[PDB]
PDB file of C-alpha atoms in Angstrom:
ATOM      1  CA  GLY A   1     -64.417  37.343 -30.022  1.00 44.69           C
ATOM      2  CA  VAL A   2     -65.565  39.061 -33.291  1.00 46.26           C
ATOM      3  CA  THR A   3     -63.665  42.209 -34.345  1.00 50.14           C
ATOM      4  CA  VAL A   4     -66.100  45.244 -34.661  1.00 50.31           C
ATOM      5  CA  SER A   5     -67.289  46.762 -38.060  1.00 50.28           C
ATOM      6  CA  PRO A   6     -64.986  49.327 -39.846  1.00 48.75           C
ATOM      7  CA  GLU A   7     -67.696  52.090 -39.404  1.00 50.02           C
ATOM      8  CA  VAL A   8     -67.250  51.553 -35.567  1.00 49.45           C
ATOM      9  CA  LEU A   9     -63.379  51.490 -35.875  1.00 49.45           C
ATOM     10  CA  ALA A  10     -63.696  54.824 -37.853  1.00 49.05           C
ATOM     11  CA  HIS A  11     -64.861  56.533 -34.593  1.00 49.72           C
ATOM     12  CA  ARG A  12     -61.843  55.091 -32.604  1.00 49.77           C
ATOM     13  CA  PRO A  13     -59.782  58.440 -32.495  1.00 49.28           C
ATOM     14  CA  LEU A  14     -62.828  60.297 -30.917  1.00 52.18           C
ATOM     15  CA  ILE A  15     -63.328  57.304 -28.525  1.00 52.67           C
ATOM     16  CA  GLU A  16     -59.701  57.499 -27.233  1.00 53.08           C
ATOM     17  CA  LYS A  17     -60.087  61.330 -26.886  1.00 54.83           C
ATOM     18  CA  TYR A  18     -62.944  61.202 -24.311  1.00 55.70           C
ATOM     19  CA  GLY A  19     -61.422  57.917 -23.016  1.00 53.15           C
ATOM     20  CA  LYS A  20     -58.274  59.724 -21.730  1.00 51.49           C
ATOM     21  CA  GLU A  21     -60.494  62.749 -20.623  1.00 50.63           C
ATOM     22  CA  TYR A  22     -62.714  60.535 -18.337  1.00 50.68           C
ATOM     23  CA  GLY A  23     -59.731  58.342 -17.261  1.00 52.06           C
ATOM     24  CA  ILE A  24     -60.958  55.098 -18.897  1.00 57.32           C
ATOM     25  CA  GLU A  25     -58.687  54.775 -22.043  1.00 60.16           C
ATOM     26  CA  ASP A  26     -58.045  51.194 -20.715  1.00 57.33           C
ATOM     27  CA  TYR A  27     -61.765  50.308 -21.465  1.00 56.12           C
ATOM     28  CA  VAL A  28     -61.826  51.597 -25.153  1.00 60.33           C
ATOM     29  CA  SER A  29     -62.545  47.963 -26.392  1.00 63.31           C
ATOM     30  CA  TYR A  30     -65.846  48.009 -24.318  1.00 66.40           C
ATOM     31  CA  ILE A  31     -66.877  51.389 -25.843  1.00 66.58           C
ATOM     32  CA  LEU A  32     -66.271  49.906 -29.372  1.00 66.73           C
ATOM     33  CA  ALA A  33     -68.239  46.708 -28.404  1.00 66.06           C
ATOM     34  CA  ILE A  34     -71.138  48.873 -26.986  1.00 63.71           C
ATOM     35  CA  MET A  35     -71.122  51.128 -30.109  1.00 63.94           C
ATOM     36  CA  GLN A  36     -71.352  48.024 -32.455  1.00 61.64           C
ATOM     37  CA  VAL A  37     -74.383  46.697 -30.437  1.00 61.41           C
ATOM     38  CA  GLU A  38     -76.047  50.183 -30.103  1.00 63.89           C
ATOM     39  CA  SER A  39     -75.790  51.497 -33.732  1.00 67.18           C
ATOM     40  CA  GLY A  40     -73.057  49.659 -35.739  1.00 66.39           C
ATOM     41  CA  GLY A  41     -71.431  53.066 -36.345  1.00 65.04           C
ATOM     42  CA  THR A  42     -74.412  53.931 -38.622  1.00 64.20           C
ATOM     43  CA  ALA A  43     -76.626  56.297 -36.489  1.00 64.49           C
ATOM     44  CA  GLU A  44     -75.658  59.955 -35.643  1.00 65.63           C
ATOM     45  CA  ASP A  45     -76.354  59.117 -31.908  1.00 65.23           C
ATOM     46  CA  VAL A  46     -73.728  56.368 -32.408  1.00 65.54           C
ATOM     47  CA  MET A  47     -73.574  55.464 -28.641  1.00 61.05           C
ATOM     48  CA  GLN A  48     -77.394  55.824 -28.160  1.00 58.10           C
ATOM     49  CA  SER A  49     -76.429  57.938 -25.088  1.00 55.76           C
ATOM     50  CA  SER A  50     -79.257  60.559 -25.538  1.00 56.83           C
ATOM     51  CA  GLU A  51     -81.453  58.863 -22.871  1.00 58.71           C
ATOM     52  CA  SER A  52     -78.593  58.776 -20.249  1.00 60.02           C
ATOM     53  CA  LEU A  53     -78.599  62.600 -20.621  1.00 60.43           C
ATOM     54  CA  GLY A  54     -82.434  62.835 -20.185  1.00 56.10           C
ATOM     55  CA  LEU A  55     -82.943  63.620 -23.896  1.00 51.97           C
ATOM     56  CA  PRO A  56     -85.379  61.940 -26.379  1.00 53.68           C
ATOM     57  CA  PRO A  57     -83.760  59.207 -28.593  1.00 51.86           C
ATOM     58  CA  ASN A  58     -81.199  60.299 -31.285  1.00 50.94           C
ATOM     59  CA  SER A  59     -80.920  63.925 -29.932  1.00 48.40           C
ATOM     60  CA  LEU A  60     -77.083  63.989 -30.003  1.00 48.11           C
ATOM     61  CA  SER A  61     -74.485  64.481 -32.773  1.00 48.76           C
ATOM     62  CA  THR A  62     -71.755  61.826 -33.358  1.00 50.21           C
ATOM     63  CA  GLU A  63     -69.277  63.839 -31.167  1.00 52.26           C
ATOM     64  CA  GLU A  64     -71.919  64.596 -28.441  1.00 54.54           C
ATOM     65  CA  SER A  65     -72.916  60.874 -28.397  1.00 54.84           C
ATOM     66  CA  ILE A  66     -69.263  59.584 -27.972  1.00 55.23           C
ATOM     67  CA  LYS A  67     -68.514  62.163 -25.184  1.00 53.74           C
ATOM     68  CA  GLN A  68     -71.700  61.288 -23.165  1.00 55.44           C
ATOM     69  CA  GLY A  69     -71.390  57.525 -23.904  1.00 54.17           C
ATOM     70  CA  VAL A  70     -67.805  57.415 -22.502  1.00 55.52           C
ATOM     71  CA  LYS A  71     -68.685  59.814 -19.585  1.00 55.66           C
ATOM     72  CA  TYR A  72     -71.731  57.666 -18.616  1.00 55.42           C
ATOM     73  CA  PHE A  73     -69.671  54.435 -18.886  1.00 56.27           C
ATOM     74  CA  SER A  74     -66.955  55.961 -16.576  1.00 57.59           C
ATOM     75  CA  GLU A  75     -69.635  57.080 -14.046  1.00 54.80           C
ATOM     76  CA  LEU A  76     -71.025  53.488 -14.042  1.00 56.28           C
ATOM     77  CA  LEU A  77     -67.425  52.124 -13.541  1.00 57.15           C
ATOM     78  CA  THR A  78     -66.940  54.510 -10.572  1.00 56.31           C
ATOM     79  CA  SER A  79     -70.306  53.556  -8.969  1.00 59.20           C
ATOM     80  CA  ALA A  80     -69.482  49.804  -9.489  1.00 56.79           C
ATOM     81  CA  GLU A  81     -66.038  50.286  -7.818  1.00 56.77           C
ATOM     82  CA  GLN A  82     -67.750  51.902  -4.756  1.00 59.33           C
ATOM     83  CA  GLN A  83     -70.372  49.091  -4.551  1.00 60.34           C
ATOM     84  CA  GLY A  84     -67.861  46.259  -5.285  1.00 63.24           C
ATOM     85  CA  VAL A  85     -69.613  44.811  -8.384  1.00 61.88           C
ATOM     86  CA  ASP A  86     -67.864  43.444 -11.566  1.00 62.56           C
ATOM     87  CA  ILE A  87     -67.481  44.768 -15.191  1.00 63.28           C
ATOM     88  CA  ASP A  88     -70.391  42.741 -16.676  1.00 63.71           C
ATOM     89  CA  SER A  89     -72.758  44.567 -14.234  1.00 65.53           C
ATOM     90  CA  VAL A  90     -71.270  47.887 -15.670  1.00 65.82           C
ATOM     91  CA  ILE A  91     -71.936  46.688 -19.238  1.00 69.11           C
ATOM     92  CA  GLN A  92     -75.539  45.694 -18.325  1.00 71.29           C
ATOM     93  CA  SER A  93     -75.999  49.041 -16.468  1.00 74.12           C
ATOM     94  CA  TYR A  94     -75.209  50.956 -19.700  1.00 72.02           C
ATOM     95  CA  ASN A  95     -78.407  49.338 -21.021  1.00 72.05           C
ATOM     96  CA  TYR A  96     -80.510  49.123 -17.772  1.00 71.51           C
ATOM     97  CA  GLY A  97     -79.281  52.228 -15.935  1.00 71.39           C
ATOM     98  CA  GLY A  98     -77.292  52.538 -12.673  1.00 70.42           C
ATOM     99  CA  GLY A  99     -80.033  50.883 -10.586  1.00 70.79           C
ATOM    100  CA  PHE A 100     -78.840  47.482 -11.911  1.00 70.05           C
ATOM    101  CA  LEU A 101     -75.492  47.970 -10.012  1.00 66.63           C
ATOM    102  CA  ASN A 102     -77.424  48.318  -6.655  1.00 64.49           C
ATOM    103  CA  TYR A 103     -79.521  45.231  -7.557  1.00 65.29           C
ATOM    104  CA  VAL A 104     -76.405  43.050  -8.234  1.00 63.32           C
ATOM    105  CA  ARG A 105     -74.711  44.434  -5.075  1.00 63.23           C
ATOM    106  CA  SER A 106     -77.671  43.226  -2.983  1.00 62.68           C
ATOM    107  CA  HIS A 107     -77.529  39.756  -4.695  1.00 62.73           C
ATOM    108  CA  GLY A 108     -73.884  38.584  -4.432  1.00 59.92           C
ATOM    109  CA  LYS A 109     -72.053  41.501  -6.185  1.00 61.23           C
ATOM    110  CA  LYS A 110     -71.506  39.487  -9.422  1.00 59.55           C
ATOM    111  CA  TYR A 111     -73.366  39.750 -12.725  1.00 60.25           C
ATOM    112  CA  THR A 112     -75.433  36.669 -13.710  1.00 61.18           C
ATOM    113  CA  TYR A 113     -77.799  36.290 -16.683  1.00 61.13           C
ATOM    114  CA  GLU A 114     -80.480  35.243 -14.107  1.00 59.72           C
ATOM    115  CA  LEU A 115     -80.052  38.648 -12.350  1.00 61.59           C
ATOM    116  CA  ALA A 116     -80.314  40.565 -15.720  1.00 58.53           C
ATOM    117  CA  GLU A 117     -83.418  38.548 -16.613  1.00 57.25           C
ATOM    118  CA  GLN A 118     -85.153  39.032 -13.190  1.00 58.39           C
ATOM    119  CA  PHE A 119     -84.349  42.802 -13.158  1.00 56.44           C
ATOM    120  CA  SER A 120     -86.019  43.108 -16.640  1.00 51.76           C
ATOM    121  CA  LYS A 121     -88.997  40.894 -15.497  1.00 49.26           C
ATOM    122  CA  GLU A 122     -89.620  43.282 -12.592  1.00 47.61           C
ATOM    123  CA  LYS A 123     -89.026  46.584 -14.490  1.00 45.94           C
ATOM    124  CA  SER A 124     -91.258  45.501 -17.428  1.00 45.13           C
ATOM    125  CA  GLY A 125     -94.156  44.352 -15.229  1.00 46.71           C
ATOM    126  CA  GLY A 126     -93.667  40.889 -16.790  1.00 47.43           C
ATOM    127  CA  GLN A 127     -94.417  42.005 -20.393  1.00 49.59           C
ATOM    128  CA  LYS A 128     -92.703  39.751 -23.003  1.00 46.62           C
ATOM    129  CA  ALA A 129     -91.692  40.416 -26.642  1.00 44.16           C
ATOM    130  CA  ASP A 130     -90.473  38.093 -29.422  1.00 43.88           C
ATOM    131  CA  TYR A 131     -86.716  38.331 -29.831  1.00 42.51           C
ATOM    132  CA  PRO A 132     -85.577  36.591 -33.034  1.00 46.20           C
ATOM    133  CA  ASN A 133     -81.926  36.874 -31.987  1.00 47.81           C
ATOM    134  CA  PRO A 134     -79.608  33.822 -32.394  1.00 49.80           C
ATOM    135  CA  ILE A 135     -78.209  34.530 -28.837  1.00 52.35           C
ATOM    136  CA  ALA A 136     -81.717  34.367 -27.328  1.00 53.10           C
ATOM    137  CA  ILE A 137     -83.268  31.481 -29.428  1.00 55.38           C
ATOM    138  CA  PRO A 138     -81.201  28.620 -27.752  1.00 56.06           C
ATOM    139  CA  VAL A 139     -81.665  30.215 -24.258  1.00 59.05           C
ATOM    140  CA  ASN A 140     -85.557  30.582 -23.947  1.00 56.54           C
ATOM    141  CA  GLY A 141     -86.897  30.137 -27.496  1.00 56.85           C
ATOM    142  CA  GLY A 142     -86.197  33.761 -28.489  1.00 60.24           C
ATOM    143  CA  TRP A 143     -88.031  36.253 -26.291  1.00 61.27           C
ATOM    144  CA  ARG A 144     -87.239  38.990 -23.756  1.00 58.02           C
ATOM    145  CA  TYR A 145     -88.937  41.166 -21.105  1.00 56.27           C
ATOM    146  CA  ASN A 146     -89.957  44.630 -22.385  1.00 55.13           C
ATOM    147  CA  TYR A 147     -87.270  46.546 -20.389  1.00 52.45           C
ATOM    148  CA  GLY A 148     -83.812  47.061 -21.871  1.00 51.90           C
ATOM    149  CA  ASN A 149     -82.108  43.902 -23.081  1.00 51.07           C
ATOM    150  CA  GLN A 150     -81.537  40.991 -20.692  1.00 50.07           C
ATOM    151  CA  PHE A 151     -79.054  39.554 -23.361  1.00 50.51           C
ATOM    152  CA  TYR A 152     -77.055  42.818 -23.546  1.00 51.56           C
ATOM    153  CA  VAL A 153     -73.899  41.452 -21.874  1.00 49.07           C
ATOM    154  CA  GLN A 154     -73.889  38.388 -24.295  1.00 45.41           C
ATOM    155  CA  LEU A 155     -74.364  40.756 -27.312  1.00 47.49           C
ATOM    156  CA  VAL A 156     -71.582  43.214 -26.254  1.00 47.75           C
ATOM    157  CA  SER A 157     -69.251  40.202 -25.301  1.00 42.78           C
ATOM    158  CA  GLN A 158     -69.421  38.956 -28.969  1.00 42.20           C
ATOM    159  CA  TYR A 159     -67.291  41.959 -29.997  1.00 42.27           C
ATOM    160  CA  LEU A 160     -64.741  41.673 -27.118  1.00 43.72           C
ATOM    161  CA  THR A 161     -61.522  40.021 -28.251  1.00 43.81           C
ATOM    162  CA  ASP A 162     -59.115  38.459 -25.662  1.00 42.79           C
ATOM    163  CA  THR A 163     -55.632  39.210 -27.060  1.00 45.35           C
ATOM    164  CA  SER A 164     -53.853  37.991 -23.815  1.00 45.24           C
ATOM    165  CA  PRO A 165     -51.349  35.037 -24.225  1.00 47.24           C
ATOM    166  CA  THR A 166     -53.376  31.921 -25.261  1.00 46.67           C
ATOM    167  CA  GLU A 167     -52.941  28.566 -23.472  1.00 47.36           C
ATOM    168  CA  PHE A 168     -51.526  25.420 -25.133  1.00 43.31           C
ATOM    169  CA  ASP A 169     -54.054  23.461 -27.185  1.00 46.69           C
ATOM    170  CA  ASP A 170     -54.911  19.875 -26.085  1.00 47.67           C
ATOM    171  CA  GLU A 171     -52.609  18.369 -28.775  1.00 49.56           C
ATOM    172  CA  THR A 172     -49.484  20.315 -27.566  1.00 53.24           C
ATOM    173  CA  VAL A 173     -50.335  19.478 -23.920  1.00 51.86           C
ATOM    174  CA  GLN A 174     -50.301  15.754 -24.999  1.00 51.99           C
ATOM    175  CA  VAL A 175     -46.896  16.274 -26.782  1.00 52.22           C
ATOM    176  CA  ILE A 176     -45.480  17.855 -23.526  1.00 51.23           C
ATOM    177  CA  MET A 177     -46.899  15.195 -21.175  1.00 49.56           C
ATOM    178  CA  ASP A 178     -46.004  12.245 -23.521  1.00 47.08           C
ATOM    179  CA  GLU A 179     -42.384  13.479 -23.368  1.00 42.19           C
ATOM    180  CA  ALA A 180     -42.447  14.331 -19.621  1.00 39.76           C
ATOM    181  CA  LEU A 181     -43.873  10.844 -18.694  1.00 40.40           C
ATOM    182  CA  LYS A 182     -40.945   9.051 -20.427  1.00 39.16           C
ATOM    183  CA  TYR A 183     -38.843  10.190 -17.421  1.00 37.66           C
ATOM    184  CA  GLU A 184     -41.485   9.340 -14.753  1.00 37.56           C
ATOM    185  CA  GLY A 185     -39.728   7.617 -11.815  1.00 37.49           C
ATOM    186  CA  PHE A 186     -36.244   8.967 -12.849  1.00 36.34           C
ATOM    187  CA  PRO A 187     -34.060  10.375 -10.021  1.00 38.58           C
ATOM    188  CA  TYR A 188     -33.615  14.092  -9.302  1.00 36.00           C
ATOM    189  CA  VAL A 189     -30.193  15.215 -10.618  1.00 36.37           C
ATOM    190  CA  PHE A 190     -29.032  18.773  -9.772  1.00 36.02           C
ATOM    191  CA  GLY A 191     -27.656  20.282 -13.019  1.00 33.73           C
ATOM    192  CA  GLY A 192     -29.285  17.624 -15.245  1.00 35.57           C
ATOM    193  CA  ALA A 193     -31.042  18.684 -18.483  1.00 36.72           C
ATOM    194  CA  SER A 194     -31.045  15.432 -20.602  1.00 34.91           C
ATOM    195  CA  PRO A 195     -32.362  11.814 -20.257  1.00 33.34           C
ATOM    196  CA  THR A 196     -28.629  10.697 -20.091  1.00 32.76           C
ATOM    197  CA  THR A 197     -27.872  12.793 -16.931  1.00 32.54           C
ATOM    198  CA  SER A 198     -31.550  12.743 -15.646  1.00 32.58           C
ATOM    199  CA  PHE A 199     -32.971  16.141 -14.626  1.00 31.81           C
ATOM    200  CA  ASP A 200     -33.422  19.057 -12.245  1.00 31.23           C
ATOM    201  CA  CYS A 201     -36.772  20.966 -12.221  1.00 31.93           C
ATOM    202  CA  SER A 202     -35.813  23.582 -14.924  1.00 32.38           C
ATOM    203  CA  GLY A 203     -33.792  21.064 -16.957  1.00 34.63           C
ATOM    204  CA  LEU A 204     -36.949  18.882 -17.354  1.00 36.86           C
ATOM    205  CA  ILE A 205     -39.016  21.947 -18.503  1.00 38.53           C
ATOM    206  CA  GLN A 206     -36.340  22.998 -21.034  1.00 39.71           C
ATOM    207  CA  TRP A 207     -35.988  19.470 -22.521  1.00 39.90           C
ATOM    208  CA  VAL A 208     -39.763  18.642 -22.603  1.00 43.37           C
ATOM    209  CA  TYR A 209     -40.855  22.063 -24.008  1.00 43.54           C
ATOM    210  CA  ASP A 210     -38.105  21.779 -26.705  1.00 43.10           C
ATOM    211  CA  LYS A 211     -39.573  18.446 -27.998  1.00 45.56           C
ATOM    212  CA  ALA A 212     -42.968  20.332 -28.156  1.00 46.50           C
ATOM    213  CA  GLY A 213     -41.185  22.998 -30.305  1.00 47.16           C
ATOM    214  CA  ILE A 214     -40.883  25.637 -27.540  1.00 45.62           C
ATOM    215  CA  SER A 215     -37.490  27.274 -26.704  1.00 45.60           C
ATOM    216  CA  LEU A 216     -37.128  28.218 -23.055  1.00 44.76           C
ATOM    217  CA  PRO A 217     -34.114  29.340 -20.908  1.00 47.49           C
ATOM    218  CA  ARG A 218     -32.188  26.856 -18.710  1.00 49.28           C
ATOM    219  CA  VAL A 219     -32.590  28.365 -15.154  1.00 46.41           C
ATOM    220  CA  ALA A 220     -35.968  28.478 -13.271  1.00 42.30           C
ATOM    221  CA  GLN A 221     -35.527  32.285 -12.624  1.00 38.28           C
ATOM    222  CA  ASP A 222     -34.820  32.842 -16.406  1.00 39.51           C
ATOM    223  CA  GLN A 223     -37.896  30.669 -17.359  1.00 39.94           C
ATOM    224  CA  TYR A 224     -39.961  32.836 -14.934  1.00 40.49           C
ATOM    225  CA  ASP A 225     -38.627  36.022 -16.582  1.00 41.21           C
ATOM    226  CA  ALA A 226     -39.293  34.650 -20.117  1.00 38.88           C
ATOM    227  CA  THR A 227     -42.958  33.752 -19.307  1.00 41.33           C
ATOM    228  CA  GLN A 228     -46.012  35.924 -18.443  1.00 43.19           C
ATOM    229  CA  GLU A 229     -47.856  36.155 -15.079  1.00 42.93           C
ATOM    230  CA  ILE A 230     -51.366  34.664 -14.891  1.00 43.92           C
ATOM    231  CA  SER A 231     -53.823  34.226 -11.975  1.00 42.99           C
ATOM    232  CA  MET A 232     -54.168  30.716 -10.495  1.00 43.13           C
ATOM    233  CA  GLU A 233     -57.871  30.711 -11.558  1.00 39.17           C
ATOM    234  CA  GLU A 234     -56.966  31.339 -15.271  1.00 38.98           C
ATOM    235  CA  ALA A 235     -53.944  28.847 -15.247  1.00 39.19           C
ATOM    236  CA  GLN A 236     -54.280  25.795 -17.638  1.00 41.26           C
ATOM    237  CA  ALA A 237     -52.344  22.579 -18.509  1.00 39.61           C
ATOM    238  CA  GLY A 238     -48.926  23.395 -19.955  1.00 38.82           C
ATOM    239  CA  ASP A 239     -48.557  26.610 -17.891  1.00 40.14           C
ATOM    240  CA  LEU A 240     -45.674  26.695 -15.449  1.00 39.90           C
ATOM    241  CA  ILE A 241     -45.859  27.086 -11.699  1.00 39.48           C
ATOM    242  CA  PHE A 242     -42.974  28.710  -9.830  1.00 44.17           C
ATOM    243  CA  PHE A 243     -41.873  28.395  -6.130  1.00 47.13           C
ATOM    244  CA  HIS A 244     -39.609  30.654  -4.061  1.00 47.90           C
ATOM    245  CA  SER A 245     -37.683  29.477  -0.986  1.00 48.58           C
ATOM    246  CA  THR A 246     -37.384  25.693  -1.735  1.00 49.91           C
ATOM    247  CA  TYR A 247     -33.496  26.024  -1.468  1.00 48.87           C
ATOM    248  CA  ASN A 248     -30.721  28.702  -1.622  1.00 47.21           C
ATOM    249  CA  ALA A 249     -30.512  29.431  -5.416  1.00 46.65           C
ATOM    250  CA  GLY A 250     -29.418  33.077  -5.000  1.00 45.22           C
ATOM    251  CA  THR A 251     -32.621  34.110  -6.921  1.00 41.40           C
ATOM    252  CA  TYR A 252     -36.297  34.589  -5.803  1.00 45.08           C
ATOM    253  CA  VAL A 253     -37.438  31.713  -8.091  1.00 44.28           C
ATOM    254  CA  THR A 254     -35.989  28.287  -7.073  1.00 45.06           C
ATOM    255  CA  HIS A 255     -38.584  25.743  -8.217  1.00 48.15           C
ATOM    256  CA  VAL A 256     -40.628  25.202 -11.467  1.00 48.05           C
ATOM    257  CA  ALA A 257     -43.297  22.576 -12.419  1.00 49.39           C
ATOM    258  CA  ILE A 258     -45.637  21.706 -15.358  1.00 51.50           C
ATOM    259  CA  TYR A 259     -49.167  22.638 -14.276  1.00 53.27           C
ATOM    260  CA  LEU A 260     -51.900  20.132 -15.181  1.00 52.45           C
ATOM    261  CA  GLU A 261     -55.180  21.134 -13.494  1.00 51.74           C
ATOM    262  CA  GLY A 262     -56.714  21.648 -10.092  1.00 48.63           C
ATOM    263  CA  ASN A 263     -53.855  21.054  -7.661  1.00 48.65           C
ATOM    264  CA  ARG A 264     -51.878  18.691  -9.932  1.00 46.88           C
ATOM    265  CA  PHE A 265     -48.437  19.300 -11.390  1.00 46.19           C
ATOM    266  CA  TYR A 266     -45.544  17.349 -12.938  1.00 46.71           C
ATOM    267  CA  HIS A 267     -41.937  18.202 -12.052  1.00 49.67           C
ATOM    268  CA  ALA A 268     -38.399  17.013 -11.460  1.00 47.38           C
ATOM    269  CA  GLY A 269     -38.846  16.380  -7.789  1.00 43.25           C
ATOM    270  CA  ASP A 270     -37.460  13.177  -6.240  1.00 44.82           C
ATOM    271  CA  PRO A 271     -38.334  10.977  -8.098  1.00 42.46           C
ATOM    272  CA  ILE A 272     -39.604  12.638 -11.387  1.00 39.69           C
ATOM    273  CA  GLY A 273     -43.393  12.515 -11.280  1.00 41.13           C
ATOM    274  CA  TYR A 274     -46.510  14.273 -10.068  1.00 39.20           C
ATOM    275  CA  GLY A 275     -47.108  16.613  -7.095  1.00 38.19           C
ATOM    276  CA  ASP A 276     -49.997  18.276  -5.219  1.00 38.75           C
ATOM    277  CA  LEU A 277     -50.187  22.122  -4.882  1.00 38.93           C
ATOM    278  CA  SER A 278     -52.773  21.746  -2.044  1.00 39.08           C
ATOM    279  CA  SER A 279     -49.915  20.341   0.217  1.00 41.01           C
ATOM    280  CA  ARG A 280     -48.709  22.593   3.117  1.00 39.41           C
ATOM    281  CA  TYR A 281     -45.088  22.668   1.752  1.00 40.54           C
ATOM    282  CA  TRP A 282     -45.957  23.712  -1.873  1.00 41.88           C
ATOM    283  CA  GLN A 283     -48.748  26.173  -0.787  1.00 42.85           C
ATOM    284  CA  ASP A 284     -46.291  28.027   1.539  1.00 40.35           C
ATOM    285  CA  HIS A 285     -43.551  28.174  -1.196  1.00 40.82           C
ATOM    286  CA  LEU A 286     -45.906  29.034  -4.123  1.00 40.15           C
ATOM    287  CA  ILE A 287     -45.093  32.174  -6.204  1.00 43.08           C
ATOM    288  CA  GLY A 288     -47.741  31.517  -8.861  1.00 44.91           C
ATOM    289  CA  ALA A 289     -48.532  30.449 -12.372  1.00 44.72           C
ATOM    290  CA  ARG A 290     -46.827  31.812 -15.577  1.00 43.80           C
ATOM    291  CA  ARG A 291     -47.722  31.236 -19.227  1.00 43.16           C
ATOM    292  CA  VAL A 292     -45.365  30.439 -22.128  1.00 42.08           C
ATOM    293  CA  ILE A 293     -45.998  33.068 -24.872  1.00 43.11           C
ATOM    294  CA  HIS A 294     -47.050  31.474 -28.229  1.00 42.28           C
ATOM    295  CA  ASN A 295     -49.836  31.749 -30.754  1.00 43.47           C
TER     296      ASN A 295
END
């Protein structure tokens, strides 16, 4: 998740210009990551987009290069959308050409390094070249097929930074669960938010997250509103899982639990302990996972 060079960030206003023009201002981080890999903001053909236009290498000015680079990336996005293939296939197609999208589509519709490698093997006629790149050395000794770059997605991914809310580290998860397990076996108490009174689902969350140094609201619906939506596949230990029609609370959100992993959760159910998401009752009442915002 390396931030790009200042000479790449210097081209950012021009990037956002053709970004909004080709309706892909959302993907400006990918254009910066591609530019860092292609030239480092050093070359005049800063996107190395001359070839995509049928021109010999470095035939475009800095402005020409950014316009065509963004245009070509948006055409690849569009073709990928039609074919039902993912963003890493788009990134690889900037390097390999649009034919890589059709290749991935016919082989499971998801980018894999093995697909990038086999596409290069075929297009190069099996010709290999030494590649003294620290990304390549631990993978195959440091070589590549003489067609594009089979490591292109790994190179471009180095300069992509995930700024989305980060999950709790292992130490904080242990602080949360050490506190939560002190009340294991305790009875469910509607309106309870202390060991003295015992707890309700949201009262357990508020008390346990406070001991971990996290301030959260008191009501499940408020805790839902104060946290950010995440897919079940990206959910981690310490994230919260919310449920809808478990009882008449007068709000959409009625139930909340501490997510652990897989189908496991901890919550003030009756008695206070662990539950299984995979169960018919919880699967039918499941809203989804939400993340507590912290650094």
